[PDB]
Amino acid sequence: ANQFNSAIGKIQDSLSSTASALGKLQDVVNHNAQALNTLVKQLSSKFG
Amino acid sequence: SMTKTSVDCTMYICGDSTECSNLLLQYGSFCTQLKRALTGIAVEQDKNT
Structure with a gap:
């Protein structure tokens, strides 16, 4: 009970201080946002 | 792993x-997507190693 409660408290302190562990899910936001922002810039170029 | 390549449009x-x-700049972002795809x-390939 000293080992298990202190190990789960280090998980809660790491996710609050550092957001870099969730950055695999942040790329799922980022790869969908950069695909939409590139597709809407196709109308500005003249295509010849 | 495979062979890592990079292709320039210029x-x-x-x-x-x-x-x-x-006349290449009138086509816009066609080579923006191709350079980011070969980078990705x-x-x-280094994450597979």
Whole structure:
């Protein structure tokens, strides 16, 4: 009970201080946002 | 893993002329997507190692 409660408290302190562990899910936001922002810039170029 | 490659649109399409580089910028983001796709292959080939 000293080992298990202190190990789960280090998980809660790491996710609050550092957001870099969730950055695999942040790329799922980022790869969908950069695909939409590139597709809407196709109308500005003249295509010849 | 596979062989990591990178393809430029400038030296491949154009023969180093000023007319080809002016008509390449009218097409816009066609070579923006191709350079970011071959970059994203080469990051994931190092993650396989």
